[PDB]
Design a protein around this ligand. Sequence first.
Ligand code: MAN
Ligand code: MAN
Ligand code: MAN
Lengths: 247, 247, 247, 360, 360, 360
Amino acid sequence: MSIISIILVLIFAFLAGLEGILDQWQFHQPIIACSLIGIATGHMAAGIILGGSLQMIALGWANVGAAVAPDAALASVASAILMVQGGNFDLTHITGVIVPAAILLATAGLVLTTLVRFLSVGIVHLADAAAEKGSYSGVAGWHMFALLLQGLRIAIPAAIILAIPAETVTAALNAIPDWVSKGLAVGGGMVVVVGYAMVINLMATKELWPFFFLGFVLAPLSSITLIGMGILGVVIALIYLNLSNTA
Amino acid sequence: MSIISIILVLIFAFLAGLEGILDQWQFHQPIIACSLIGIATGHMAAGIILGGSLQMIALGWANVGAAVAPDAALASVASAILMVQGGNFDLTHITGVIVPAAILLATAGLVLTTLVRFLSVGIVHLADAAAEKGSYSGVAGWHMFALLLQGLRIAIPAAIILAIPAETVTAALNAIPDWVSKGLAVGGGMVVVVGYAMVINLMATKELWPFFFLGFVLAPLSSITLIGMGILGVVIALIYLNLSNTA
Amino acid sequence: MSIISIILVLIFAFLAGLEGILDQWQFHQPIIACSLIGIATGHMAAGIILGGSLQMIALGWANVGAAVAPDAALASVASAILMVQGGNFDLTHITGVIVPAAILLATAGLVLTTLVRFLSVGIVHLADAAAEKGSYSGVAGWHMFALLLQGLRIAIPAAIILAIPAETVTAALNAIPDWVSKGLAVGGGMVVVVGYAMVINLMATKELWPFFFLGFVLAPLSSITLIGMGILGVVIALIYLNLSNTA
Amino acid sequence: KKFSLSKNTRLSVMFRSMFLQGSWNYERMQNLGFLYSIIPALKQFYKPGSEEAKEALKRHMEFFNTHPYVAAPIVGVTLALEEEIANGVEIDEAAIQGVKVGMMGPLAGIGDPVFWFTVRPIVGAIAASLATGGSIIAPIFFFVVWNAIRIAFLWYTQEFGYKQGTAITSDLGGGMLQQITKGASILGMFILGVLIQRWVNISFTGPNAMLPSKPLADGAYVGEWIDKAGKVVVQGAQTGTTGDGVAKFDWLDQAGNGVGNGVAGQGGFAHYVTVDQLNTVDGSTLHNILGQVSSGLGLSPEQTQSLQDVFNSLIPGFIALLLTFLVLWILRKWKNKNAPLFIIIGMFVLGIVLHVAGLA
Amino acid sequence: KKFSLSKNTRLSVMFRSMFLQGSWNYERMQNLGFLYSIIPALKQFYKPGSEEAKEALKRHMEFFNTHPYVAAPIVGVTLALEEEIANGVEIDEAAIQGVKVGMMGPLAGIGDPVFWFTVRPIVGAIAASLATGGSIIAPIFFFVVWNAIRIAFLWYTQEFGYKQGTAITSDLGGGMLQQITKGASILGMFILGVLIQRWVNISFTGPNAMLPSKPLADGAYVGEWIDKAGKVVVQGAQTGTTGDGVAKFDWLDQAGNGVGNGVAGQGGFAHYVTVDQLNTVDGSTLHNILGQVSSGLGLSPEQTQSLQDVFNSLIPGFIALLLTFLVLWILRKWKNKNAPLFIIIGMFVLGIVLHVAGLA
Amino acid sequence: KKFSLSKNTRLSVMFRSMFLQGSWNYERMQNLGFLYSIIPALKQFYKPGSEEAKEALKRHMEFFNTHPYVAAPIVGVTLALEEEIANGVEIDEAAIQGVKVGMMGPLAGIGDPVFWFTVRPIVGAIAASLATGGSIIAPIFFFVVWNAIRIAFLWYTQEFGYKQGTAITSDLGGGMLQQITKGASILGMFILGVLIQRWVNISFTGPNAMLPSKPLADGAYVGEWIDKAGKVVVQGAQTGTTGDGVAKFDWLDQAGNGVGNGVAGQGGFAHYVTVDQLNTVDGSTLHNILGQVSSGLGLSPEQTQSLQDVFNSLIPGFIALLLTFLVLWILRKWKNKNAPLFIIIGMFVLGIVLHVAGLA
Ligand SMILES: OC[C@H]1O[C@H](O)[C@@H](O)[C@@H](O)[C@@H]1O
Ligand SMILES: OC[C@H]1O[C@H](O)[C@@H](O)[C@@H](O)[C@@H]1O
Ligand SMILES: OC[C@H]1O[C@H](O)[C@@H](O)[C@@H](O)[C@@H]1O
């Protein structure tokens, strides 16, 4: 691999790690992170395809009130790097192996970020000690140091994976039998149901189930794109809210 | 015809006759009766095709409050037997001849069941006389006897039609001119209008006509199946009822 | 051109000129006027095509309260005559040249009808003077004279255009460069936006915008025709009005 | 308090209430079915031949007509009152008949539209749509779905009625059933519109009813550009329309080169020819033809239009809607008893007339 | 009570009220049309030249501007009071003018959006959609539908106004007309959205505006597997990917047998080739090609993507909606009189610019 | 009244509030981000090292957890009270903490479903739909749309909060936030139904799960009429069905003439044969085949039906809906912490089982 690709991947992984806690520019989402990693290491189409495939799983992966989500950042970065190392992008191997590996690395990233967000307590206590002296520089530096540590939490494993020889990782990835890979590919079309079900469970009522079933029934109309259905849902909501506010 | 096929047809006709008054297991419906009779006498696809074609006519053929319906039971059974006797299942003969014959046999079955349900008054009087003695066995026996008579009302004509030689019925069915057969086939695509129109006349209001026209307008969307349109109607009704109950 | 065709064109232009002020039988609309003029001078398909193309622009061209509209009458008549004189009906020349010419002639007809409806004041004063004598004949004659003058307002330019030799008008129409004709054809698919936008601007509210967006979203369902979408709009309006009147 | 009906006895009572009809009369409607349903309870309560058995059997020999499916609540209420009257409680003999008469009417009035006119037409229509192809999935669907719904309704409603006793009137009430009735009516109207549009086919193709065919154009349909001695060419950039009124085109052979340089049509170098006159279509001509048919061009040189095409261009289901409203008006104005059969015969005669006239 | 207008006189009055315009002025709008409509009634009432006739003629020479279609109720009410004033009743002379002025305003304000902005655009749009193919069904549809609606409205509303007299104000009222206005506005907004989506074509194909074409794949498009010396083969089960990074496949001739057993691509036994390079496509190769095109595979080796393709992938009618809102903002900000013509000229110039730039 | 924050300082404050997280803890949630956001205001107000700076820095060292996007109003309100406390106003020290705690809860509760569960899933789903083809339009769309919405929201809401001060509570209040939440929930449920239908593919084709193939018919599919020694014919008008039970047909060659005049099928003159056995398809046979495939006829002599075909005939997305409801029930009943991962592993095992069994 080219050296410039190596630094590009390192900066992209660092940005994804920072955004995993920042959650602002969404550099940690698979659609962004995988596409960027594909951009750095040549082939871009495979990276965007993996990002699109993994974003459906990453839907409903938000963290609320000390309930950390499965951490799509490390999943996306590590899965993209592992696919890049293994020179095969048939979109059947992407769904068969790269997506289950992404789920496992998502769990690993969740535990790693749990450790880091627990470790940040000492940094914040040191920042409070600095603020006891009335210095903006100390608290700003400690905040930036905690941010840098959280970014390194995903920067470091990317470098470790990059250090692994290409031949060994290709041999390990090819050793997977064909039948289990095809079965995992089949289950990859199911695994999005779990995330969709969490999102539904968070927001579901007897009043709102008819809208879910209406969207399900109207979906086979392929002439309407996803933006068309978004506008349709918005106008349906507007009409329903108007008619409800009449009374 | 095979002997075992003959007994199977007799039992199926008996079941259809029983259900014609029972109206519980729907063995009298063309979709069930015609398919069963086709299954018994070999060729089953033609029986299911005839049952599906005749079920559209049989829609809206319910009997309410001493207003006996056109009796789809005898129509289905006799039409299926007549088609089986005439070894031609081109689906043009099915619509041209078997469906008008089904309508005529439906009228005949209506008059026959009117006679039987009038005759059951004596059986019920005998059951009352038995109940005057405080015996459950007598009333149960008279009820079962009346039910058996109603089943025989359609079992017997099936046997009579089965006794008719195959050659004579085939000759009679073939003698129908081609032009009148094609005209009757053309009118078979119209005759379902009456069946739909009675159901529409039963439930129709200035408030509900917009839903009829909406269903008419949305029908050309062939990507939505009949179950899809059923769910769509259910969700539309739910949303309308919610918005109406808000006020 | 045939003499009988000349008389037919003159009569049709007179009818369009009368209808431009009458606004009753709609002989002035392009869908009627252009089709009639094409009927008179042989080729009818080109006339109907141009009328349909120009009718979309002519939508929203009504005149209300002394605000005279762009006068689709003279536009339709003169554009149809000019198209007929130039023996080319490729539907690219129709959109490229005949439609911008129709717009310009529409402006010219607007100014001409402004002049005529200003000139009608003297005719009406003469009618009032006649009515001062208590005679129905005088006022009826003056009304018919004003109507005849308004019809002549469009009858006369049609005759003037017909007097122009075919060779000269064909040479003038062919002299237009290909690139500008293609650009005008491209802009002819956009110019209907203004006509639609005036109608939208006249009737638009925060309550009614969702219906505009719903119609926009549901349009790609090509299985529904324009009459189907009209019935859909009517039933949607009925359901909305019912649910609003419940409260 | 002895004489407690068990779950097995109630299941047997439900399976016998499956036979609520069969002894159907005109003066005492559907009266023996109730007794046949409640036979096991009376057998468990009183032995045959006793005066108590006589009175119990004579009590349920009165008129009782209800929609068969919505009668399980009535059977459960009757079982509850039979248990009470078998436990030495004061409830009067006429109370059971009074409550049966009370819930006989409204329950049937709700049941007929919901079951016979809403559920059955929908299930049968779906079954027939599946059966159009002659597949066993359709009778299986109808039987399984209808019987599952029926068994569930009967069993659970009988259990609810037995549990609630006479208090089920405070649960059914008014307004509660009207919501179900109106929702079922909305669903039925929607489904009936769909069924009228999809299953009333009056195709007017025929050998008459064909509007005159338009020669179309010289390339608006699927075809190639044949020139004199075979070979397929493509129209090139226009070199300038001649003063006569015919444009000159470049004739590019299907290799990128140029040859001929004549005018487009018959007398010129090449003319448009449809696939019928083509021979040895092998090569890139098949690719061009496939591209043209993927574009959407028809294969006929003349655009043939029928009356059905015009009606569909207006709106699909035009004649079906007109027939539906005509039949509706006839049914609303005739007010006869055999009118539907007469209208069916009328449309059969109408189809014969249309076929002999060449329209449909 | 003599001087009773007949049905024929009322029909003539309606056919004359069809000429309500024609003597259209700027200071006394649409005033002679009313007199021309009501001439037969006055002629039947008073002979020409009398003082009564002079007063009647001078009475209806005042300003009267209303939507022409919704004026038959006014004409009928005027006929009613003309009958009353011709039967020796004491209705004051200014009462007819007062009622005419009263229903002049609201009736016009309701009829203007309903007829000119809702009914006419819808009927004309349907006619244009039918006329896109150059068929006579479209002018016939427009004329017949519009004139049937107009004649029915005029006749029936004039009859209602004549029957009701001045009491028609108690029937029109307020709120009743607002429901029609709101329903018409809803239908018009829906139809205008549909029209904007379907009839604003700004196709951005061009020679420019073409995104770079991706080589696609080696079987993702329509094509066959050619192996050196003719013949067409099919890929088989993989025998095991080689360590170099190229998988080995089984090459089955189109009979079931196995030939070659090489690698897939150029240097191997066979390579994918589209229909262009195929010769003698006769046989089962046509069946395979038809199956492929039925699957949905394109015929081009390179997936060419346009700017229009990107816009459609986002949502069809994207540029149409953007132009609609831009034009709307221009219209509500300019507040000029010739602004529409200027915007039309600007869009023609914009189309010229787009065409010369190779975009559209 | 000195110490007035400028527009540039507010822009810097917003860009720093972009870093509201990063020092995320478990006991004092998201506390340093607020100070890092409001550092420039304190620097402009008080110099480092002073007791005022000490108190200001210690004031904002308390627990503060909110949705990061809806915190700009809080930051603007805090800037307002910081200006007031730097202008000699008697606002108590705990007032800022009280207002921060007040809008900490409801704002987060409203922003969590709107942003993380409604806006983000929709934008990500659209991006993935665009990315299915491996196109750069999808990451660009996601980045641009999401960041435009985020920057606009942050900047404008911070400006509104700064302008309104503590009065923003009288504007937010209750009710309107519930309307926004309900609308977002309706849109999210609709979009989730669409996504479940469109993006859960469980195709059950397999080598198993194939229903038995029906021989179909003798012309219901795409094919020609082959007669012994080559040539293709068409069925003519029936000459009368023979008494045996086989109809006799006319065999019209593809020129208009009549040859053979036998019976239809194998032993007769001609039999139906699909495109596979055809050779030298050149001529009008290709036109006939193209017409047949345009009609809608399949190319296979035997109609092969899969389990997926049956499920689609019922309704597309049947298995997807069943899986959705099964997973919903499992998630509602398990109430564990690692349940989603276990369910995902179960789905992968289920996919392996289905593949090895030949179903999916
Ligand atoms: O509703 C009265 C009732 O009468 C009979 O029992 C049957 O025809 C039922 O189908 C009907 O519902
Ligand atoms: O509404 C006023 C009215 O004025 C004139 O009579 C015409 O332009 C009508 O179309 C318009 O409706
Ligand atoms: O809602 C509380 C809030 O807590 C943290 O800041 C993050 O997990 C946010 O995504 C979440 O919204």
